[PDB]
Design a protein around this motif. Structure first.
Motif, short mmCIF file in Angstrom:
data_model
loop_
_atom_site.label_atom_id
_atom_site.label_comp_id
_atom_site.label_asym_id
_atom_site.label_seq_id
_atom_site.Cartn_x
_atom_site.Cartn_y
_atom_site.Cartn_z
N UNK A 1 -21.61 3.18 40.99
CA UNK A 1 -22.57 2.24 41.57
C UNK A 1 -21.88 1.19 42.42
N UNK A 2 -22.12 1.28 43.72
CA UNK A 2 -21.64 0.27 44.65
C UNK A 2 -22.40 -1.02 44.42
N UNK A 3 -21.75 -2.13 44.69
CA UNK A 3 -22.33 -3.42 44.37
C UNK A 3 -23.05 -4.05 45.55
N UNK A 4 -23.07 -3.37 46.70
CA UNK A 4 -23.86 -3.80 47.85
C UNK A 4 -23.22 -3.47 49.18
N UNK A 5 -23.67 -4.14 50.24
CA UNK A 5 -23.20 -3.81 51.57
C UNK A 5 -23.32 -4.96 52.55
N UNK A 6 -22.60 -4.83 53.66
CA UNK A 6 -22.75 -5.74 54.78
C UNK A 6 -22.66 -4.95 56.06
N UNK A 7 -23.34 -5.45 57.08
CA UNK A 7 -23.32 -4.86 58.41
C UNK A 7 -22.55 -5.78 59.33
N UNK A 8 -21.54 -5.23 59.99
CA UNK A 8 -20.68 -6.02 60.84
C UNK A 8 -20.19 -7.28 60.15
N UNK A 9 -20.36 -8.42 60.81
CA UNK A 9 -19.91 -9.69 60.28
C UNK A 9 -21.01 -10.41 59.50
N UNK B 1 -31.00 -1.14 58.44
CA UNK B 1 -30.33 -2.40 58.71
C UNK B 1 -29.07 -2.21 59.55
N UNK B 2 -28.33 -1.12 59.31
CA UNK B 2 -27.11 -0.88 60.08
C UNK B 2 -27.43 -0.60 61.53
N UNK B 3 -28.33 0.36 61.77
CA UNK B 3 -28.54 0.84 63.12
C UNK B 3 -29.37 -0.14 63.95
N UNK B 4 -30.10 -1.02 63.27
CA UNK B 4 -30.74 -2.15 63.94
C UNK B 4 -29.76 -3.02 64.72
N UNK B 5 -28.48 -2.94 64.40
CA UNK B 5 -27.49 -3.80 65.04
C UNK B 5 -26.84 -3.12 66.26
N UNK B 6 -27.27 -1.89 66.54
CA UNK B 6 -26.77 -1.12 67.64
C UNK B 6 -27.88 -0.96 68.68
N UNK B 7 -27.70 -1.56 69.85
CA UNK B 7 -28.75 -1.53 70.85
C UNK B 7 -28.98 -0.09 71.29
N UNK B 8 -30.23 0.33 71.23
CA UNK B 8 -30.62 1.67 71.61
C UNK B 8 -30.56 2.71 70.50
N UNK B 9 -30.07 2.34 69.33
CA UNK B 9 -29.99 3.32 68.25
C UNK B 9 -31.38 3.63 67.75
N UNK B 10 -31.61 4.90 67.41
CA UNK B 10 -32.89 5.32 66.88
C UNK B 10 -32.74 6.52 65.98
#
Length: 330
Positions: free
Chosen positions: A198-206, A234-243
């Motif tokens: 069990x991973x304890x969580x995550x972060x996207x970029x900074x 949440x991750x791909x929301x930070x990449x312009x144009x990702x879908x």
């Protein structure tokens, strides 16, 4: 005893990794895909349907003086990604990076699915999940690691996958020069036969770290990182144009993008996956749409810490009576 073998990406995008394995007497060296998500050691062989062999190195048990047919035994496996293979079973001597097991069940393919045939670089799989998943019937067989464990200096193996570069699988010892900082160990459940934790969580970029339990498996035999759709969105929301592209079958992003990193928690520690690790290149030759290395686990039924995640770490697979996993940065 110990073993140490180099593991090498099969192509420029780390679509999988192969590790040389010596089988039989005299040794027949095959390049196997070490898979902590399965528990069968199987190989292309002289028994494999000829049309289903295309470039692979084959095991010929009749040329091995230590090969013995395991009478009555058969195997058949289907992988989560839809691929499959099946055949009969020999026992033979198998060595990995200096470490030798006698009487290892070598599962000989009579049939393989097209994705295996089309992968000229992978001569088979060497499973490193728990032997409870082994498919040999009517007598279940032990993994290479299970067979080796008692003889190892320490009942462990480690995965050190490289990014666009070779790495290392070690058996029986922890190379304290291969990582930075400390190894953080975390609990494993073997109830599904996997290295499940069990991973304890995550972060996207900074961004800020989101503390949340993510149950998943450490799987060297899966290429990408598969996580819950919330996390992935949440991750791909930070990449312009990702879908998300249903026609392509996952998240795609403009190849012109600079991808953010992705951090996952191991206890109080943090493994940082660099953004470049998450680029698996154009969806088709010449395309400016690139395939993402973080994808949704929705519809797999399990979260998978595959190579994208594992290659950012030094990973200890601790096969002690109570197994655990360890992660260090490197």
């Amino acid at each position: 005893s110990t073993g140490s073998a180099t593991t090498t990406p099969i192509d420029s995008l780390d679509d999988a990794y192969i590790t040389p394995v010596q089988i039989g007497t005299p040794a027949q060296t095959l390049n196997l895909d070490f898979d902590t998500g399965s528990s069968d050691l199987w190989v292309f062989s002289s028994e494999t349907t000829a049309s289903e062999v295309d470039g692979q190195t084959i095991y010929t048990p009749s040329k091995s003086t230590t090969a013995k047919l395991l009478s009555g035994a058969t195997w058949s496996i289907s992988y989560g990604d839809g691929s499959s293979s099946s055949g009969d079973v020999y026992t033979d001597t198998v060595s990995v990076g200096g470490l030798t097991v006698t009487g290892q069940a070598v599962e000989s393919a009579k049939k393989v699915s097209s994705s295996f045939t089309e992968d000229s670089t992978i001569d088979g799989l060497l499973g490193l999940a728990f032997s409870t998943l082994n498919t040999v019937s009517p007598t279940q067989q032990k993994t290479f690691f299970d067979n080796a464990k008692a003889s190892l200096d320490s009942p462990v193996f480690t995965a050190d996958l490289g990014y666009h570069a070779p790495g290392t699988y070690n058996f029986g010892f922890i190379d304290t020069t291969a990582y930075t900082g400390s190894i953080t160990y975390t609990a494993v459940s073997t109830k599904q036969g996997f290295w499940e934790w069990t991973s304890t969580g995550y972060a996207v970029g900074s961004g800020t770290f989101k503390s949340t339990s993510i149950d998943g498996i450490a799987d060297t035999g899966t290429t990408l990182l598969y996580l819950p759709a919330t996390v992935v969105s949440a991750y791909w929301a930070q990449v312009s144009g990702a879908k998300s592209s249903s026609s392509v079958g996952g998240y795609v992003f403009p190849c012109s993008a600079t991808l953010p990193s992705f951090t996952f928690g191991v206890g109080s520690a943090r493994i940082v996956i660099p953004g470049d690790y998450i680029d698996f290149g154009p969806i088709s030759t010449g395309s400016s749409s690139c395939f993402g290395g973080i994808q949704s686990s929705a519809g797999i039924g399990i979260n998978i810490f595959g190579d994208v995640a594992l290659k950012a770490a030094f990973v200890v697979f601790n096969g002690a009576t109570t197994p655990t996993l360890g992660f260090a940065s490197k």
